[PDB]
Amino acid sequence: TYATLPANVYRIAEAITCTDDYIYVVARDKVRYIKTSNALIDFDPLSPTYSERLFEPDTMTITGNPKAVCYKMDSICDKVFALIIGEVETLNANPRTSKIIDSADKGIYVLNHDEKTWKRVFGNTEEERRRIQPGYANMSTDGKLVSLSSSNFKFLSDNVVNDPETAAKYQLIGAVKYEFPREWLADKHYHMMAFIADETSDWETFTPQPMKYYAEPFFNWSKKSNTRCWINNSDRAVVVYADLKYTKVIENIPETSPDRLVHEYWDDGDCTIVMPNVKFTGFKKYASGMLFYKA
């Protein structure tokens, strides 16, 4: 698509979402429904309207906080999230790129559709809400991951309890021992965690899970080619190429036209089918079995 904005989000842009049916863009906690293909357009001389399809008219503007400075947003299948940090800077309007502070209502925000309203399932409490920081947080999603991101783990409440046994063998009258609530945390430097949650649920209450690549949440997701890119703070750019099976798919041509090697004959019955001598090199696993023909 082209042009820009409902004209409320003009300039002042924040993140993106493709989904499948239609695009999403956000600013000041706003939205746009722009259809990926075959949206509405007319040249009636209001606005340039050059046959650059204009956006759906309405907007949602989640919760009650204007200029809420939603952070990066991403989508898989048909669903979105749109993490918001907090803040709004505490003063209405103004740019959302300066002096971010901590405010209520921060969360991932879902947006289960057909209601044009966003559910916000992650932070329901300061416990879960504090885990998001204005700095160093991202929603980035490898296919069926939606990792969120975090740091700043702190033993809270039930993380310390009881300890009767330490009172034994001593006089201490009381003690506090940790419960070690299990949250996978990275080694190396700037220890990082992840809230990754997938399927099994309908997303819906992220829970801590091992982060595969060490700041998977900082990668820029891509769907076509299904690879993820990012930049190492060393100024190098890292690529994760995802995966493949070794299926060759030998001789794919429709029945029409020459140059197709594999085809079936008949003579008074008596099938005869011919193939090129399939071969390939390079597969680095020592594993063997069929070449295993399939359609």
Partner 1 sequence: MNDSSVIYRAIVTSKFRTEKMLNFYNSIGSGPDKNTIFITFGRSEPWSSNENEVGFAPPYPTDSVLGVTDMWTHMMGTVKVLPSMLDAVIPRRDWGDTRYPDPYTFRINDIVVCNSAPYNATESGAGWLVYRCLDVPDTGMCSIASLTDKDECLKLGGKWTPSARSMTPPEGRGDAEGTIEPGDGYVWEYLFEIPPDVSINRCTNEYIVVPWPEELKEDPTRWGYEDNLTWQQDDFGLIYRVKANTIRFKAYLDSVYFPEAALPGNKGFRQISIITNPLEAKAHPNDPNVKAEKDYYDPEDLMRHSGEMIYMENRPPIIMAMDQTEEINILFTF
Partner 2 sequence: KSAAQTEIMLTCTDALNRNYITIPRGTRFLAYAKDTSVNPYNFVSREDVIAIRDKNNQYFPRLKLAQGRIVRTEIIYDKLTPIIIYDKNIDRNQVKLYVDGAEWINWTRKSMVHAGSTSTIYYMRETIDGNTEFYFGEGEISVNASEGALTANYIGGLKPTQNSTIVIEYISTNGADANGAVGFSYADTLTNITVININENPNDDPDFVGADGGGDPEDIERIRELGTIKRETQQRCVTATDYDTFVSERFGSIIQAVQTFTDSTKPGYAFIAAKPKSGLYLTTVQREDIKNYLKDYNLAPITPS
Partner 3 sequence: ESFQFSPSYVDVSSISNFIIGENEYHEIQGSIQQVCKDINRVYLMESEGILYLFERYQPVVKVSNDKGQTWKAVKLFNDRVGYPLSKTVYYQSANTTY
Residue 200 interacts with partner 1 (CB under 8 A): yes or no:
no
Residue 238 interacts with partner 3 (CB under 8 A): yes or no:
yes
**Closest separation in Å from C-beta 97 to partner 3:** 6
- Letters for 138-157 (x = contact with partner 3 by CB under 8 A, - = none) are x-x-----------------
Residue 234 interacts with partner 2 (CB under 8 A): yes or no:
no
- Selected binder of partner 1 within 12, 39, 60, 185 (CB under 8 A): 185
Residue 188 interacts with partner 1 (CB under 8 A): yes or no:
yes
Distance (Å, rounded) from C-alpha 237 to C-alpha 241?
13
Q: Which helix (H) or strand (E) holds 26?
A: strand 24-26
Scan residues 273-292 and list those touching partner 2 (CB under 8 A): 286
Looking at the Cβ atoms of 169 and 284, the one nearer to partner 3 is 284
Contacts of residue 108, Cβ cutoff 8 Å, sequence gap at least 6: 81, 82, 83, 120, 121, 122, 123, 139, 148, 206
Residue 225 interacts with partner 3 (CB under 8 A): yes or no:
yes
Task: Characterize the bridge pairing of strands 263-265 and 237-240.
Answer: unpaired
Residue 220 interacts with partner 3 (CB under 8 A): yes or no:
yes
Q: Judged by CB under 8 A, which stretch of 70-78, 187-195, 201-209, 248-256 contacts partner 3?
A: 70-78
Contact assessment for residue 29 and residue 84, using Cβ atoms and an 8 Å cutoff: yes
Q: Which residues pair with 238 in a beta bridge?
A: 230
| Residue showing tokens 């949602």 | 60
Q: Among 59, 58, 39, which Cα is nearest to 49's?
A: 39
Contact assessment for residue 129 and residue 121, using Cβ atoms and an 8 Å cutoff: no
**Closest separation in Å from C-beta 140 to partner 3:** 7
**Which pair of structure tokens corresponds to residue 54?**
């204009």
Return the C-alpha torsion angle 25, 119, 68, 21, nearest 10: 0
Q: Among 227, 186, 52, 29, which Cα is nearest to 120's?
A: 29
- Letters for 171-200 (x = contact with partner 2 by CB under 8 A, - = none) are ----------------------------xx
**Which pair of structure tokens corresponds to residue 265?**
């004959």
Contacts of residue 111, Cβ cutoff 8 Å, sequence gap at least 6: 62, 79, 80, 81, 82, 117, 118, 119
Residue 247 interacts with partner 2 (CB under 8 A): yes or no:
no
Looking at the Cβ atoms of 11 and 284, the one nearer to partner 1 is 284
Distance (Å, rounded) from C-alpha 211 to C-alpha 148?
10
- Selected binder of partner 1 within 186, 222, 227, 250 (CB under 8 A): 186
Residue 241 interacts with partner 2 (CB under 8 A): yes or no:
no
Q: Is 130 left (phi over 0), alpha (psi -120 to 50) or beta?
A: alpha
Looking at the Cβ atoms of 110 and 215, the one nearer to partner 1 is 215
3-state secondary structure of 16: strand
Scan residues 227-246 and list those touching partner 1 (CB under 8 A): 231-235, 238
Binding-site size, partner 2 (CB under 8 A): 3
138 binds, options partner 2, partner 1, partner 3, none, Cβ within 5 to 8 A by partner type: partner 3
**Contact residues: partner 3, CB under 8 A:** 1, 13-20, 23, 36, 69, 71-72, 74-75, 96-97, 138, 140, 213, 218, 220-225, 227, 229-232, 234-247, 283, 285-290, 294
**Contact residues: partner 1, CB under 8 A:** 151-156, 160, 163, 166-167, 170-192, 210-215, 231-235, 238, 284, 286
**Contact residues: partner 2, CB under 8 A:** 199-200, 286
